[PDB]
RNA sequence: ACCCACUCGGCACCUUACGAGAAAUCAAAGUCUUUGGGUUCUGGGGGGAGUAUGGUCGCAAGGCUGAAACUUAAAGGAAUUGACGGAAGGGCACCACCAGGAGUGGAGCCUGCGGCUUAAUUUGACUCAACACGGGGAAACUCACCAGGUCCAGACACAAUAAGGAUUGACAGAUUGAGAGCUCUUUCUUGAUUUUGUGGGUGGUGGUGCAUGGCCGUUCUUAGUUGGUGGAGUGAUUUGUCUGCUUAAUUGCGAUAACGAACGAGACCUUAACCUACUAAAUAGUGGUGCUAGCAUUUGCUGGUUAUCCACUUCUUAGAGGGACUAUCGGUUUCAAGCCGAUGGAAGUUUGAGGCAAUAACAGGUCUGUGAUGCCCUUAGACGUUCUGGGCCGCACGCGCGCUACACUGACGGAGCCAGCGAGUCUAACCUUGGCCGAGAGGUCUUGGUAAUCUUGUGAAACUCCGUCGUGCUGGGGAUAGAGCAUUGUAAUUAUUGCUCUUCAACGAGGAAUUCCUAGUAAGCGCAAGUCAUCAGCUUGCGUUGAUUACGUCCCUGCCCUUUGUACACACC
């Protein structure tokens, strides 16, 4: 054959970030709990799933991709 | 033609540690018992063997 | 001198085999385990070696005598069967010549093989037995090559990570060829399905056909293999199987220590041919009439009518059979097997053509047909696979198959108008008539057909006819090239194909050379089929037109078979 040349440049993939998850919420004066991060407005998602906040961008992730409801 | 008629034939790749050998097996089913086919090689020729006779015996004649 | 009987002593030829022997053979190589007439000499595995040494001889070169160390399993003899021959003698054949046909070889051009060129120009294959071969006509697929981009489809088991989250996925952005979350920005989403390591699996058109199966090509257009009882030989083994004759033929006849069989050739099987005899049919068709056209009219002719009824099976179709057995006759030959001509027959070259095809062989090709396969290799920065694009087509030349021509037995323009084997659309876009529109290509509205029912009668081509050309590269020729129009197709630039106008090459019958073939064949001609979305200068079968020359031989050539030699038997690589 010829085995191996390469301009170098070897790549990875990703990590599934890491991060300890969902404090995001806020239960205050006993034991009243509100919700910080609003939740998706499509049936497929059982209002247990919420909208990340970029700039402009608020989108649904239970939607693997689909649909942006912004605010 | 006889071929098509009187010989079963197989092959089998018997596969093994070392390699495979073909098995190849040929049978002649007796054209005697051919049931519905041609009941012997086309090759055959049987005569029928006559009959000894005590012939002559000048005319005479029977009547019923 | 001869002739002859017989006789001693010579050189020998022969027939035999009482007898010998390992056998070839030997009348001595006989009278030898049933071992003894007399006598001389030599040898005791193969090397080392007739070497060294000593003695001797001879001018000399050399002679005579003549060891050992070490080494080593054979070396050796006769004969058997193979293999092999740059030994001889017979054959066979259009893959070989003869007599001739039609060519390629000369040109343009279509393919393939080389070489060169490229990032890549993927690869197998090299005499017949590699080079239109891999069913190999590659735009993406294919795809093997090259530039790049994704994805696990990493069984399974054990280990660790881990419900505080092992893992998945992504909208927009950047990024990229890409509306690939490949990555990165951002931060939700998922929830024991993976993921990280090992052990072990897994794919692979990676290597190995020189590890294999299977298949396949060649040897072979050949005629060969073999066992019974009997003859020979201690056995290997032979004889049968063979001078000749004949045959496509170990076909026979015949010869004969053999007889009498078998596998293979044959027989057989398929397909072309022959039926006024058989059984049949609106998916075949012929006759008669009805229904009706047009001509002539005395009657006649020539058409329309997928069922208005009658009848039949010469055409067609295919089930069942009949027919040829070189019959007849005359020739000629071991009057044998055969062969020759003639009558006759549908047919008398194995009737024509194929299908099938014994033993044994080749390091023949085929791990690129396979989820046939051993071993090697690789296995996530993949030789797995997939998506993007180029490449297999690259252009100084070499080679092989072809296509088209070189024109007047013609090219063109009308016109006559004649086949066969094939093939076609259900979970769908096949073959397609007819009706339009378009010069062409095609476009379009319909329709029949799962097909002996419809395209189709495949009104094909060669060709037959009345002209237009006028021998001049000319109205032969159609290379190359520009311009447009269409058509398959997600996609046509490197131009898939098609059509139109213009352009108008070489080539004037081809050196040395080499193929193919004996009758419905050669060669001319087109069509169907494969491949197929699109693309035949390809091939497989089809029919149409349809010839001059053999019905010989062995000169070449290839290959058999017999004798022979042999020190090869992994068999002349
Ligand atoms: Mg003897
Ligand atoms: Mg020495
Ligand atoms: Mg010999
Ligand atoms: Mg002859
Ligand atoms: Mg000649
Ligand atoms: Mg010639
Ligand atoms: Mg090779
Ligand atoms: Mg590609
Ligand atoms: Mg693993
Ligand atoms: Mg494979
Ligand atoms: Mg081989
Ligand atoms: Mg093989
Ligand atoms: Mg021939
Ligand atoms: Mg004996
Ligand atoms: Mg013999
Ligand atoms: Mg008939
Ligand atoms: Mg006659
Ligand atoms: Mg080889
Ligand atoms: Mg194979
Ligand atoms: Mg491993
Ligand atoms: Mg190629
Ligand atoms: Mg060829
Ligand atoms: Mg004409
Ligand atoms: Mg127009
Ligand atoms: Mg001209
Ligand atoms: Mg022309
Ligand atoms: Mg075709
Ligand atoms: Mg081809
Ligand atoms: Zn949602």
Swiss-Prot record, chain A:
Modified residues (Phosphoserine): 41
Localization in the cell: Cytoplasm
Cross-link Glycyl lysine isopeptide (Lys-Gly) (interchain with G-Cter in ubiquitin) residue location(s): 26, 32
Residues in C4-type zinc fingers: 40-63
Highest taxon of the lineage: Eukaryota
Quaternary organization: Component of the small ribosomal subunit (SSU). Mature yeast ribosomes consist of a small (40S) and a large (60S) subunit. The 40S small subunit contains 1 molecule of ribosomal RNA (18S rRNA) and 33 different proteins (encoded by 57 genes). The large 60S subunit contains 3 rRNA molecules (25S, 5.8S and 5S rRNA) and 46 different proteins (encoded by 81 genes).
Function of the molecule: Component of the ribosome, a large ribonucleoprotein complex responsible for the synthesis of proteins in the cell. The small ribosomal subunit (SSU) binds messenger RNAs (mRNAs) and translates the encoded message by selecting cognate aminoacyl-transfer RNA (tRNA) molecules. The large subunit (LSU) contains the ribosomal catalytic site termed the peptidyl transferase center (PTC), which catalyzes the formation of peptide bonds, thereby polymerizing the amino acids delivered by tRNAs into a polypeptide chain.
Protein name (Swiss-Prot/TrEMBL): Small ribosomal subunit protein eS31
Residues of the full protein shown: 82 to 152 of 152
UniProtKB/Swiss-Prot annotation, chain B:
GO BP, one annotated term: maintenance of translational fidelity
GO CC field: 90S preribosome; cytoplasm; cytosol; cytosolic small ribosomal subunit; nucleus; preribosome, small subunit precursor
Family note: Belongs to the universal ribosomal protein uS3 family.
Protein name: Small ribosomal subunit protein uS3
GO MF term (any one): RNA binding
Subunit annotation: Component of the small ribosomal subunit (SSU). Mature yeast ribosomes consist of a small (40S) and a large (60S) subunit. The 40S small subunit contains 1 molecule of ribosomal RNA (18S rRNA) and 33 different proteins (encoded by 57 genes). The large 60S subunit contains 3 rRNA molecules (25S, 5.8S and 5S rRNA) and 46 different proteins (encoded by 81 genes).
Cross-link Glycyl lysine isopeptide (Lys-Gly) (interchain with G-Cter in ubiquitin) residue location(s): 39, 51
Domain of life: Eukaryota
GN (gene name): RPS3
Modified residues (Phosphoserine): 60
Keyword Chaperone in record: no
UniProt KW Ribonucleoprotein keyword: yes
